Every structure is written in C-alpha cells, then in structure tokens.
Amino acid sequence: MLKAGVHFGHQTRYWNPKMKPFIFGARNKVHIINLEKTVPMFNEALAELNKIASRKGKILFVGTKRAASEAVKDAALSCDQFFVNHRWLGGMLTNWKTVRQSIKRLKDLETQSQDGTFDKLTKKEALMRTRELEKLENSLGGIKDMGGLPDALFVIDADHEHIAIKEANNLGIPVFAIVDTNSDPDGVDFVIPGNDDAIRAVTLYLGAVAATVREGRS
RNA sequence: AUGGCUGUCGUCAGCUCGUGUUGUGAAAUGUUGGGUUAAGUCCCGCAACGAGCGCAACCCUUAUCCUUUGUUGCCAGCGGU
C-alpha cells in the first residue's frame, strides 16, 4: 500500500552496513529506504500473521521510544493482544519462571486494592502500596493475563529493544521487527525496513498489524 | 580431636542465594550508576528479575495525658488537735 508515508531514512553518518539492500543516499546527508522493496516484505509478514493469528495465538508488541510508547498500548487493546510499552524487564521471557511470580504479585493486590484492605494498615502503607503497583503496572500491565510465552513478537526499533529480540532467539519465538538503517537485521526473522521514531509512520505500520489480526481471527 | 558458652572487628552495613543472561573458563551481573539516608535507607535508571540473613520496626525503661483502683501510700477543701 505505497501511500504518503514518512519512513525514508534514519541518518547517513553511521547506518549499518548489513542494511545495504535498502539504501538511497539523499543529498541532505540522509539515507532513504527503498520503499518498493519494503512492501514486498511488509505484506508477507502480515501474511505470516494470519498463519499465526488463526492458531489462536498471542501476539506481543514491544517498543518504547518515548514516542511510540503509548501508540502500542491502544493498538493492542484495540485487539485482545498483549504489549510491553514503558520499560522491558530483562528476562521476562527466558526467566518467565520468576516473572510469573511478579504478575501474580500484581493481581494478588490488584484484587486487594480495589475492594478490601487498601486503607486498613496506615496511610503511610497506602503511600507506598499505591506506589508499588504503579511501579509494576507500567512494566507488566499488558502481559499480566497472557499466562504463557508468545508465539510471535513485534518490535518497533530493533537496536533500541535488542534485549527483547535476543530473548526471542534463545527459544524459537519468531520475532519480526520494524528495523531502521542503523539497526541490525540478523536477529529478526521477518525483517521489514521502515521508520522507528516517527509518529504517523509507526501508526501506519502498527495500524496494519492491529487490523490484520482481528480480521484474521475467523 | 570436640560440643556448649564467650571475646573481637562492631550495632560496623554489610553477607549471600535461586533463576535468567554474559564469558572457553576462574567468574561477572544482580549488590554497579544518578540522588538520598544513621543504614544494601528509599527513589529513579539499568540484563537483570526476585528472595534470604542483617538494617529499621516489634520488646523493656524513661518523658506527657486520660480511665480504673485508693491500702500499709496521699492531704486540696473540710472538723478536731
């Protein structure tokens, strides 16, 4: 769907020479991504999603960037999928035997602090007991009811969330990511070259994948 | 040869483990960093996520008030002396 996008480059001072088949050097010292090679690779990753969304699987979206942080949360609860948006805990997939006891710790007191003994200890306990779920809810809020490990994983910037890509390479979770010209397209399975730090571009990329999973649910 | 008990650094703020990761490995990470605290005290950050022993609080005494009780303790207002 070659439309009026914004993704066309992300600096030419350093790049990533493994990102050589997607290069046009503009005279403003700016790399341009060849978009007519993106859309053969963009639609095939969404074609792999209907292979996976028909399995009644769990799609997990990760990307923070401080610009696409809130953009992935509303585009995941637009569907019934899962997200990590504020900060990605190191070892939330490989060490899920311990992180399971943290999302259980959250919903044990999310059960508690809505009805019962949220005010029956002190005020100074309620000064920090409201603080400790508001520490864990913006680290585990999209993942708290998943109850497993995802069978796909969507990254918005590859070298910014390389910790999440590498954990979905130890075990066979197929990660497919919006990579940039400075990112490294080797840990990603279904590489799609695009824009990682533009708002209207990341809503175009994520509005497509949030569309294709709910129409893919037959 | 030891048990039990005790000194000491020193009431010093430290000492570790599980899992995950990194490294061929001894190991490292966590526990470092930016602040803060009497304190590994707390917060923010961060391939770490958690937990344990300490730290703190819980215990006793002292500092204030109230209630109950009024003797062998007490005397403000009352009578005698």
Q: Distance in angstroms, CA of A170 to C1' of B20?
A: 12
Q: Distance in angstroms, CA of A208 to C1' of B69?
A: 82
Q: How far apart, in whole angstroms, are the C-alpha atoms of residue A2 and residue A11?
A: 22
By C-alpha distance, which of A81, A101, A82 is closest to A91? A101
**Local structure of A196: helix, strand or coil:** coil
Count H helices, E strands: chain A?
A: 6, 7
Q: How far apart, in whole angstroms, are the C-alpha atoms of residue A139 and residue A133?
A: 10
**Local structure of A197: helix, strand or coil:** coil
Q: Distance in angstroms, CA of A94 to C1' of B28?
A: 19
A169 touches strand B (CB under 7 A): no
By C-alpha distance, which of A64, A54, A106 is closest to A85? A64
Q: Distance in angstroms, CA of A98 to C1' of B3?
A: 42
**Other CB atoms within 10 Å distance of the CB of residue A194:** 26
What nucleotides of chain B have any atom within 7 angstroms of a protein Cβ? Answer: 18-22, 42-50
For residue A124, which amino acid is it?
Answer: K
- Tokens coding A11: 């600096």
By C-alpha distance, which of A158, A161, A196 is closest to A177? A158
CB-based contact A213:A59 (threshold 8 Å)? yes
Q: Distance in angstroms, CA of A126 to C1' of B61?
A: 32
Across all strands, nucleotide nearest A95 (CA–C1'): B20
CB-based contact A209:A18 (threshold 8 Å)? no
A166 touches strand B (CB under 7 A): yes
CB-based contact A58:A37 (threshold 8 Å)? no
Burial (CB < 10 A; 0-12, 13-18, 19+), residue A105, is middle
Rg over alpha carbons for chain A, rounded to the nearest Å, is 19
A94 touches strand B (CB under 7 A): yes
Q: Distance in angstroms, CA of A186 to C1' of B71?
A: 93
By C-alpha distance, which of A43, A16, A34, A28 is closest to A162? A16
What was the structure determination method?
cryo-EM
Resolution of the entry in angstroms: 2.9
**Local structure of A112: helix, strand or coil:** helix
A66 touches strand B (CB under 7 A): no
- DSSP conformational letter for A68: S
Long-range contacts of A4-9, Cβ-Cβ distance < 8 Å, separation of 24 or more: A5/A35, A5/A195, A5/A200, A5/A201, A5/A204, A6/A195, A6/A198, A6/A200, A6/A201, A7/A33, A7/A35, A7/A38, A7/A193, A7/A194, A7/A195, A7/A198, A7/A201, A8/A32, A8/A33, A8/A35, A8/A195, A9/A33, A9/A181
Query: In chain A, where does DSSP find H-type helix?
Result: 35-53, 69-74, 96-115, 125-140, 162-170, 199-214
Q: How far apart, in whole angstroms, are the C-alpha atoms of residue A32 and residue A9?
A: 4
CB-based contact A174:A153 (threshold 8 Å)? yes
**Local structure of A19: helix, strand or coil:** coil
